[PDB]
Design a protein around this ligand. Structure first.
Ligand SMILES: [Cl-]
Length: 435
């Protein structure tokens, strides 16, 4: 229904990003493009926006802002508002900040007033691009004319990229890693993920950069957005949570990192090291055990299972150990409780997670916001899809930047941890298209 066959020789990622760039700009609207299992879903225009902050929940529709006090779990407040959105539209999209996950560990008093927790909106129109076709949902005459014009011209040539230097350490990442190593040696916690920002000294074209980077990456999900003054794109390496309409819940934790994309023989040596490395094996098994404990809080008794255990997952510039965990959502639970149970990811926080999150407040630049949070897609039939926001670029108020981190354990060395962030940054640094 309401479909256009995909033109031959055109790749869906390119056409969806082109539609996002040209159609939305012609009507000056916000958008969120989400890639999920072969479907590039362009959520165009804001019909209603849910803004969850640390001290308030706002629902903005047709110029009117409704403000709400909220108490208890952020997932319950977000869930109640998003369920209302989904009475009118089939899908809702947005982002969940890293800060959304601090409440379950009783650390919310450490958040400043007006700290963003989530931004979820119902789109006016949805354009779904796949290898087979383009499907239009609630597309008005103006948007249909804009799609027609784009299909008449085809996709733009991607210009040559512009390089960035990631070797500088202005935030003292090496020193912050050494502090964390000392705390771990003293028995404070077992692991913490610390990160560093890298400025991009020039403005980038987000849709063209998205296209270029997407051609050289194999993420589990990907996104491109322009929403409330934020531009962002990313090749999500990890699925935090997926809840299907039939009740099936999925989480796919990653652990350990070796370089990738350096040649067949060099990558094979790195793969063999990763697969048989004692430290990486231990961290991955401990992360799978944590995910299973968390999912049991929301699953039907005895339904949790590891359907793929400790296998190498290739993610462009890096490769990681990964496991796929499946469960059945208990009838007494719900998709927000499943997200709350699995958020923040171990890859975003540490072990024990409460101690890792507290250490991040002291040893990382906070609030993290989008970085190590999730980009989400929610559906009226109960669906939820939440991609871990790593391997991403951001643009807010004249500033463009990248952000990458590393899992610090007792045996970590600041130099190797800094090099690990460089390997992760290489998912984006060779593919930045200047504006
Ligand atoms: Cl990262």
């Amino acid at each position: 229904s309401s479909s256009i066959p995909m033109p031959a020789g055109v790749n869906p990622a390119d056409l969806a990003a082109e539609l996002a760039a040209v159609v939305t700009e012609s009507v000056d609207e916000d958008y969120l493009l989400y890639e999920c299992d072969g479907q590039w879903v362009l959520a165009a225009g804001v019909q209603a926006m849910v803004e969850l902050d640390s001290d308030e929940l706002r629902v903005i529709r047709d110029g009117v802002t409704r403000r709400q006090q909220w108490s208890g779990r952020p997932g319950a407040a977000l869930g109640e508002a998003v369920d209302r959105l989904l009475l009118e539209t089939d899908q809702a999209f947005g982002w969940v900040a890293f800060e959304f996950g601090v409440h379950r560990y009783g650390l919310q008093q450490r958040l400043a007033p007006h700290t963003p927790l989530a931004r979820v909106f119902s789109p006016r129109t949805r354009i779904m691009v796949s290898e087979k076709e383009i499907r239009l949902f609630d597309a008005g005459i103006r948007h249909r004319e804009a799609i027609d014009r784009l299909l008449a011209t085809g996709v733009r040539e991607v210009p040559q990229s512009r390089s960035v230097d990631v070797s500088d350490d202005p935030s003292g990442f090496r020193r912050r890693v050494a502090v964390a190593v000392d705390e771990i040696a003293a028995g404070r916690y077992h692991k913490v993920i610390l990160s560093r920002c890298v400025e991009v000294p020039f403005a980038i074209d987000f849709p063209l950069t998205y296209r270029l980077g997407r051609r050289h990456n194999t993420p589990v999900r990907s996104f491109l957005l322009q929403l409330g003054g934020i531009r962002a794109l990313g090749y999500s390496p990890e699925l935090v949570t997926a809840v299907r309409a039939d009740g099936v819940v999925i989480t796919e934790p990653l652990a350990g990192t070796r370089a990738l994309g350096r040649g067949p023989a060099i990558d094979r040596l790195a793969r063999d090291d990763l697969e048989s490395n004692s430290k990486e094996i231990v961290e991955h098994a401990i992360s799978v055990r944590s995910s299973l404990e968390e999912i049991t809080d929301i699953a039907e008794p005895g339904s949790a299972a590891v359907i793929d255990f400790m296998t190498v997952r290739e993610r462009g510039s890096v490769q990681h150990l990964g496991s796929t965990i499946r469960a059945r959502l208990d009838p007494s639970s719900d998709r927000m409780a499943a997200l709350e149970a699995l958020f923040p990811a171990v890859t975003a926080s540490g072990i024990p997670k409460a101690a890792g999150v507290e250490a991040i407040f002291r040893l990382d630049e906070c609030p993290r916001g989008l970085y190590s949070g999730a980009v989400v897609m929610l559906s009226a039939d109960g669906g939820l899809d939440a991609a871990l926001t790593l391997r991403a670029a951001y643009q807010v108020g004249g500033r463009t930047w990248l952000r990458a981190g590393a899992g610090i354990i007792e045996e970590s060395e600041p130099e190797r941890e800094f090099e690990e962030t460089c390997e992760k940054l290489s998912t984006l640094t060779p593919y930045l298209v200047a504006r």
